[PDB]
Swiss-Prot record, chains A, B:
It catalyses: a CDP-1,2-diacyl-sn-glycerol + L-serine = a 1,2-diacyl-sn-glycero-3-phospho-L-serine + CMP + H(+). It is found in: Cell membrane. The chain crosses the membrane at residues 19-39, 57-77, 88-108, 112-132, 133-153, 162-182. This is CDP-diacylglycerol--serine O-phosphatidyltransferase. One of its GO terms (biological process) is phospholipid biosynthetic process.
């Protein structure tokens, strides 16, 4: 009675490690594990394509992992660490905005992103929460990120190898308590998207 | 900026209420809000069909809400209130099993359930957590529920009117701190499916 076992691919195990790291970010109150979740979220689609184990089941599991790691966990990390009515409302809006763009992304098959992608949104909020000691500013930022995530601002999907290279390293630095470089790279990505949008 | 507003239906707002209650179950450490999420989870599809606003975006938001309310939140409630390594492992397995059945059911389209549905799994775990004061027993039960959820045990999606009637009342009693009746009804449903499976 565990016929589900015949649908699991090797890339699905990468996705489950992502679900584990995203859940443990909440359970253990760990910003560090958010950064690791971004790494696994990049690794699981890569493994699927390289091993030839792409599947509809895995595509769904990948999105479900995003809910955990990048919708719920950052909203929890905001409220847990900046406990306040404003952080409560903002965590709600953040999580809701993550949910809405994942549902839109789930019915879309376009080559870029429409709105800021949810791992970028999660990175911004978590980096802000670690380096800004103000519940008010961080609660404002959560809303701004939420609005960016459900927006029509176009964002590119494939950073070239140079950007991958230095972003990968910045994420591991963030895992070990130095998130500045990852947050700065992620801000440049987000802000450039907005400027292009306003400029036309 | 926000073309997404043109695809949001009235039934999505019910789904959004569900995401809010599921998130707040975590943020506020609230067993009550799990039972309310089950109520909202039944109402959002009902409203979609009665109002003729069934949509693919809404079907995706419905499953995303389930991740939050019924995969992450019960796992968090277990570990947060029975903090221990065994509960940490059991929370992971429960949440992973919820994710796997949601990925499977996202690619499925059968009239019944295959495996124990995830709102029923969440009800069992949180009911057990409220009434059983043992981290070992509840950690065991979390695994058993996870295994049920990913199993091939067939489960009816046909609660006729009398069952809905009393289940709905029992859920509201659970919201106000009396979960025995909801837990009992859910266990009967769960155990019945097991018996029919073994009986062949
Ligand atoms: C443990 C530590 C290990 C050491 C680490 C070693 C290196 C690890 C690689 C990490 C690479 C780091 C790069 C991360 C990329 C990322 O975020 O991916 C997440 C994520 C991409 O993943 P995704 O959307 O899920 O797609 P992907 O996972 O490849 O594949 C999805 C499909 O893959 C198939 N799949 C997936 C999982 C599965 N189990 N089965 C499947 O069949 C299915 O067909 C899926 O539909 O989103 C992003 O890329 C957001 C971009 C954020 C912006 C970056 C910040 C700015 C950076 C530089 C500044 C430049 C500014 C520009 C200005 C000019
Ligand atoms: C407000 C607070 C107070 C108001 C009181 C309101 C009155 C009643 C509330 C009804 C709740 C009671 C019924 C709950 C049933 C339930 O669990 O629903 C969750 C869950 C909800 O169903 P679902 O899987 O999400 O489907 P549903 O939401 O109806 O529809 C999904 C589709 O609806 C469309 N949709 C959905 C959302 C959306 N935003 N847009 C859409 O287009 C899409 O096409 C979706 O694909 O159903 C179950 O899990 C069934 C199994 C539950 C276990 C039963 C436990 C034991 C029961 C009885 C005892 C057994 C033996 C007793 C004998 C003695
Ligand atoms: C920390 C994780 C980071 C990502 C790690 C990526 C690992 C992907 C390996 C692919 C090797 C080729 C795949 C060949 C089949 C898997 C190996 C195997 O022998 O299968 C064992 C079993 O079926 C179940 O893994
Ligand atoms: C230490 C943690 C991070 C370290 C980095 C880990 C990621 C390396 C994974 C590479 C993909 C696996 C490569 C295997 C490619 C061939 C496997 C295979 O059998 O695929 C058949 C063929 O490709 C059908 O298309
Ligand atoms: C810069 C050199 C690269 C650095 C290595 C990158 C590769 C990732 C490897 C392991 C991550 C596992 C570490 C996760 C530790 C768990 C943290 C935890 O338990 O959190 C509790 C609390 O919040 C206190 O932080
Ligand atoms: C149908 C309705 C569905 C949703 C129903 C959920 C309602 C949640 C109620 C109160 C939230 C808690 C706010 C309490 C206000 C401050 C009181 C306090 O104790 O301060 C600490 C606070 O938790 C620091 O944010
Ligand atoms: C409108 C739909 C009908 C159902 C009703 C759903 C209302 C929205 C649901 C949850 C919001 C939870 C609110 C969380 C904040 C608690 C109130 C608070 O403490 O902050 C507010 C203000 O600062 C001083 O009250
Ligand atoms: C007797 C049957 C009739 C009852 C019908 C009820 C219908 C739902 C109405 C309001 C739910 C609001 C729930 C708000 C719960 C507060 C959660 C909270 O603040 O949590 C703090 C602490 O953890 C403690 O749970
Ligand atoms: C707060 C208390 C909570 C419990 C209360 C639950 C209330 C939900 C009941 C009915 C909603 C649906 C009403 C149907 C309105 C139909 C409007 C419409 O668009 O008609 C389309 C047609 O029916 C098809 O194409
Ligand atoms: C491949 C890259 C790594 C991927 C791996 C991702 C998961 C590892 C992250 C955190 C695990 C740390 C959890 C530590 C929890 C310890 C809490 C505990 O129970 O401590 C014992 C107790 O306090 C005394 O009885
Ligand atoms: Ca991915
Ligand atoms: Ca539903
Ligand atoms: Cl199975
Ligand atoms: Cl998108
Ligand atoms: Cl995304
Ligand atoms: Cl939009
Ligand atoms: Cl099913
Ligand atoms: Cl389900
Ligand atoms: Mg993912
Ligand atoms: Mg739902
Ligand atoms: Na796959
Ligand atoms: Na809908």
């Amino acid at each position: 009675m565990f016929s589900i076992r015949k649908i699991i691919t090797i890339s699905d195990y990468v996705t489950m490690l992502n679900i584990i790291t995203g859940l443990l970010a909440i359970l253990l109150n760990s910003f560090s594990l958010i950064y690791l979740s971004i790494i696994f979220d990049s690794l699981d689609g890569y493994v699927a394509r390289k091993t030839g184990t792409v599947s509809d089941f895995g595509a769904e599991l990948d999105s479900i992992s995003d809910v955990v790691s990048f919708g719920v966990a950052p909203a929890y990390l905001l409220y847990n660490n900046f406990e306040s009515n404003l952080a409560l409302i903002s965590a709600i809006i953040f999580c809701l905005c993550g949910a809405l763009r994942l549902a839109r992304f789930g019915i879309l098959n376009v080559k870029g992103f429409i709105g800021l992608p949810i791992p970028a949104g999660a990175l911004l909020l978590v980096g802000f929460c670690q380096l800004i000691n103000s519940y008010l500013i961080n609660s404002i930022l959560a809303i701004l990120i939420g609005l960016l995530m459900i927006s029509d601002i176009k964002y590119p999907k494939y950073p070239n190898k140079i950007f991958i290279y230095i972003f990968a390293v910045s994420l591991c630095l963030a895992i070990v308590g130095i998130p500045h470089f990852a947050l700065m790279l992620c801000l440049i990505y987000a802000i450039y998207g907005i400027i292009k949008y306003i400029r036309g």
